[PDB]
Design a binder for this molecule. Structure first.
Ligand SMILES: Nc1ncnc2c1ncn2[C@@H]1O[C@H](CO)[C@@H](O)[C@H]1O
Ligand SMILES: Nc1ncnc2c1ncn2[C@@H]1O[C@H](CO)[C@@H](O)[C@H]1O
Ligand code: NA
Ligand code: NA
Ligand code: NA
Ligand code: NA
Lengths: 115, 115
């Protein structure tokens, strides 16, 4: 199915709502349900890619688009002091949902190490 | 100057060495000098882009290339159990060096929140 077989497929098909902050033909951005910062949203491709380690060379422009969408949303949400972008792979990365997703976190000082 | 006026410009011009693990015409990957995980390396564009918030639409494919390079390096370094990718913007993101850089961390469980 367009959008894949994860939570995020359901969100892309609109079968379940999400607090959508951006949509184009390539990607969707929405607030995270378990926020770790005052602003915490996700940017996902509409194309099911299960994980970054499964992305192909021809996916570069889409992956970069996630990042540009994230920049735009961050500006729309007033993240003038900055933010952190995170992509988790696999079990050591803390990936729960096997559809690529870019986290964007801000509205507080982000610490180091990044987990 | 090609490569810009930061620490990372010096690295790109080879004026100072780094432990280089990948090089192509677009990007460079090298181990971080202050590692936060058993594997911790950086992927940078050779084009000076100061921060993600300064990237333009035409930079998408280069930004995605950083991510594909990171995937390749992670595989070369044996990160079979996964990893975390991080890009810091500005002061709240913890950005120190104003040349875009993608962190890739693995070889341990990464925690949550990501800072
Ligand atoms: N239905 C949902 N809407 C928004 N974010 C979600 C949903 N389900 C899981 N998440 C978020 O997806 C991320 C998966 O990395 C988590 O940070 C989690 O909180
Ligand atoms: N000369 C260098 N070689 C490799 N990594 C470096 C160098 N200088 C700074 N760094 C790393 O650059 C990152 C900037 O975010 C830091 O994690 C820091 O440790
Ligand atoms: Na798909
Ligand atoms: Na804080
Ligand atoms: Na340049
Ligand atoms: Na750990």
């Amino acid at each position: 199915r367009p959008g894949g077989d994860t939570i995020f497929g359901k969100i892309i098909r609109k079968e379940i709502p999400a607090k959508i902050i951006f949509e184009d033909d390539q990607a969707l951005a929405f607030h995270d349900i378990s926020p770790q910062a005052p602003t915490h949203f996700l940017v996902i491709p509409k194309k099911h890619i299960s994980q970054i380690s499964a992305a192909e060379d021809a996916d570069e422009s889409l992956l970069g688009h996630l990042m540009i969408v994230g920049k735009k949303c961050a500006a729309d949400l007033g993240l003038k002091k900055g933010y952190r972008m995170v992509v988790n792979e696999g079990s050591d990365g803390g990936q729960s949902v096997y559809h690529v997703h870019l986290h964007v976190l801000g509205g507080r000082q982000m610490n180091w190490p990044p987990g």
